[PDB]
Design a protein around this ligand. Structure first.
Ligand SMILES: COc1cc(C(=O)O)cc([N+](=O)[O-])c1O
Ligand SMILES: COc1cc(C(=O)O)cc([N+](=O)[O-])c1O
Ligand SMILES: [Cl-]
Ligand SMILES: [Cl-]
Ligand SMILES: [Mn+2]
Ligand SMILES: [Mn+2]
Lengths: 349, 349
C-alpha cells in the first residue's frame, strides 16, 4: 500500500533486469532434458522450474509466461513504474538446431515487442539472439532497434561453452556499436567444462556459479580488449557487477603483472586499466542484491551514474526489498539516479 | 620515508600469509610436468615460475626458497616485524605417491620448524599436510602443535579435485579442534574439472581462478554445515575473503531459497545464517588487496576484529602497499587490530 507507482516519492522505479519466458522455449528445454541433449546446467535449472510441483516453481513459471495484466498488477503492488524485460536465461543459446534457435528467438522477440507496444509506459524490451549464428544475431540486433523498439540485447553468458571474446562472435559487437545500444550479459549455468564441483554442492545457480560464470565472461572481454576495439560499447551486468568491483585492486595488480609476463596471447596491453573500463564502459545493476553497503561500495568505485536498480522479477519478488532500497541513506539526487535516470540515460528510454 | 620494524608507529606489522618453498618439492612439480602427471593448473603455475628466466619469476623462486638472511632483510626493508609462513600452494596435495607426499610434508614441516627456532621473534609457522591421507594429516596436525610450535595449518584448497566437505576428510577437522587451531584455506589452481575456460584466457591464477576455487571451497564448507559440527573451528582465507563478504546478501538470500526448495542433498538447514558464520567462524586477511575500500567494507561486514594484514610475500612484495596500509583512514585502535592484535589473538601468538 505504501509502495506506489507514479513517482510521487521523487523518482520512478525502473527495474532493469526483469524476466519473461515463452511456453514453446520451455518445452524445448523439457525435450532436451528428456532426450539427453540438455547440458548439466539446463537439467539443474530448468529440470527444476519446469517440472517441480512446488508452489514457488509453478508461480515463477506463471509469472514468467505473463506479459499482461498479471505482471502489471505485480508491478503496481511493488511500486514498479517500468520493467526492462528479457527472455529468461539461457534463451535459445543451448539449442543445437540453428533453424530452431533463430525461429524461436524471432518469435520471442515478436511476442515481447507486441507486449511493449500494448503497455509502452510500463514494458521496455531487450532483444534475445542466438550467438551460434553471429551474423543472424547482428541482423536481429538491427531489427530490434529499428522495427521492434528494443533498447539493446541480453546475452545469457556462454553459448554452448563458448565465450564472446572469440573472434567468431565479432559481428554481434559490431552491430551493437552500429545501433549504439548496450549489451546486458546475464548469467547462465556454467558449461559442462566447469560446472561439476559447483553442481555436486548445489552451488551452480544464483548462489554462486552464476557470478563465477558471468564475472569470468565480462573479465575475458575486458582483458581481450573489447573496449579498445569498440570504445563506445557499454556492457551491463547484474548482481552488483558479479564481484568485479570488489576484486578491482587484485584484478588490476594481477592483470598488469600478467601483461608484463607476456605469457598469454590473449592478455596484451590495454589502453586503460580495468578500473578505467569500469568507469567508462561497464554498467551495473543490483539485481538480487538489495543491500545498501554493496550498492554504495559500487557507486564509490564506478561512479553513482553507473549503478542501477533492478528487481529480478519473478525470481526475486520481495516488497521489503523495494522498501529497503527506497529508504537508503543516499541524497535525493543519487537515489533518483539509481532508480530512474541512470536507466533512462543508458537504455535511452 | 622509511618503513621500520619495532612498532614505533603504534603497532607491529604481522604479515599473516607469507610463502616459502623447498627445492625438492619444486623438483617434484617439474618431474610431474615432465612425465605428464601434473594437472593443467600445476603446468600453468609451476611450469612457469620454476622455469621462466623472467625477473619476477626468478626472484619469486629465490625468495621462496630462502628461510634466512634474504627473507629477514626483505622484511626489515618493509617494516614487517613477523611473518606467518606456510609452504607455497599446492604443497604436497597433488602427489599421487602417498609415501612421497607424507615424506616431503614431514621434511617441509621440519625445515620450517628449524627456521622458526632460528628466528623466533620473526617467523611463525603453519604446518602443511597431505589430505590424500587424512588420518596421517591428523597426526601431523598434532605433531606441529605439540612438537614444532606451529600455530595451525594451511591447506591449498582442493586435493586432486576433491574438497574438504567430503566426510573422508573429517579427521583433519577433528584434529584442528582437538588442538584448537585455525585452518587457513589458501588458493590453488582449479582442478581439471573446472579450469579450462579460465586457462584459455590466462585467468586461472591469482587474477581470478584462485578466487573462484577458494571462495567455492569455503562456501561449500559453510553450506555442508562444518561449523555446526565444529562450532569452535576457525577458517581463515586471504584475498579479502574471496569476495564472499561482498556477495553476502546474495549468499544468504539464495542459500535460504535453496534450503527451502529441497533441491540439493548437500544444502540442508544450518543453525546460523551465512552472515552469522562469517562473524563467528570465518577470518579474513587482505593478502593481495592493499586497497582501503575493500578492507573497510570487510571490516564493516565481518567486524574489524576479524580482518588481518597480510603481505603475500614474495608474490606481492611491494613497499608502497605497506605505506598505503599504514596511511589508511582508520582509528589508531582499528589499525592496531588490523596489523597486530587480531593476528595475536587468532593465531595465539
Ligand atoms: C533463469 O533465470 C534466473 C534464475 C534464477 C534462479 O534460479 O535463482 C535467478 C536469476 N537471476 O538473475 O539471479 C535468473 O534470471
Ligand atoms: C603459489 O602461490 C601463490 C601464487 C600467486 C601468484 O601466482 O601470483 C599468488 C599467491 N596468493 O595467495 O595470492 C600465492 O600464494
Ligand atoms: Cl502503458
Ligand atoms: Cl628473532
Ligand atoms: Mn535475472
Ligand atoms: Mn599466497
Amino acid at each position: 500500500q505504501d509502495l506506489k507507482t507514479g513517482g510521487e516519492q521523487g523518482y520512478l522505479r525502473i527495474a532493469t533486469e526483469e524476466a519473461f519466458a515463452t511456453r514453446e522455449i520451455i518445452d524445448v528445454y523439457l525435450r532436451m532434458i528428456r532426450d539427453g541433449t540438455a547440458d548439466k546446467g539446463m537439467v539443474s535449472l530448468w529440470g527444476f522450474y519446469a517440472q517441480s510441483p512446488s508452489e514457488r516453481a509453478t508461480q515463477i513459471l506463471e509469472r514468467l509466461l505473463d506479459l499482461g495484466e498479471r505482471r502489471i498488477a505485480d508491478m503496481d503492488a511493488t511500486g514498479i513504474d517500468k520493467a526492462i524485460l528479457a527472455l529468461t536465461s539461457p534463451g535459445v543459446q543451448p539449442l543445437h538446431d540453428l533453424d530452431e534457435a533463430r525461429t524461436l528467438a524471432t518469435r520471442a522477440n515478436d511476442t515481447l515487442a507486441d507486449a511493449c507496444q500494448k503497455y509502452p509506459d510500463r514494458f521496455i524490451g531487450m532483444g534475445t539472439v542466438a550467438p551460434q549464428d553471429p551474423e543472424w544475431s547482428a541482423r536481429e540486433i538491427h531489427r530490434g532497434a529499428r522495427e521492434l523498439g528494443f533498447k539493446g540485447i541480453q546475452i545469457n553468458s556462454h553459448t554452448q561453452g563458448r565465450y564472446l571474446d572469440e573472434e567468431f562472435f565479432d559481428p554481434i559487437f559490431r552491430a551493437l556499436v552500429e545501433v549504439d545500444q548496450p549489451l546486458y550479459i546475464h548469467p547462465a549455468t556454467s558449461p559442462d567444462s566447469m560446472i561439476d564441483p559447483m553442481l555436486e554442492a548445489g552451488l551452480d545457480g544464483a548462489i554462486f556459479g552464476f557470478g563465477v560464470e558471468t564475472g569470468m565472461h565480462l573479465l575475458r572481454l575486458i582483458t581481450i580488449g573489447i573496449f579498445d576495439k569498440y570504445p563506445s560499447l557499454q556492457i551491463m551486468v547484474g548482481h552488483m557487477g558479479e564481484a568485479l568491483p570488489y576484486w578491482l585492486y587484485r584484478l588490476d595488480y594481477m592483470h598488469q603483472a600478467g601483461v608484463r609476463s607476456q605469457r598469454y596471447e590473449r592478455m596484451k596491453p590495454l589502453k586503460k586499466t580495468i578500473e578505467g573500463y569500469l568507469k567508462s564502459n561497464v554498467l551495473v545493476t543490483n539485481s538480487g542484491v538489495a543491500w545498501e553497503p554493496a550498492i554504495k561500495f559500487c557507486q564509490q568505485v564506478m561512479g553513482e551514474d553507473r549503478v542501477m536498480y533492478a528487481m529480478n522479477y519473478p525470481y526475486q519478488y520481495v516488497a521489503d526489498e523495494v522498501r529497503a532500497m527506497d529508504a537508503m541513506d543516499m541524497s535525493a539526487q543519487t537515489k533518483k539516479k539509481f532508480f530512474q535516470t541512470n536507466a533512462e540515460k543508458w537504455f535511452k528510454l
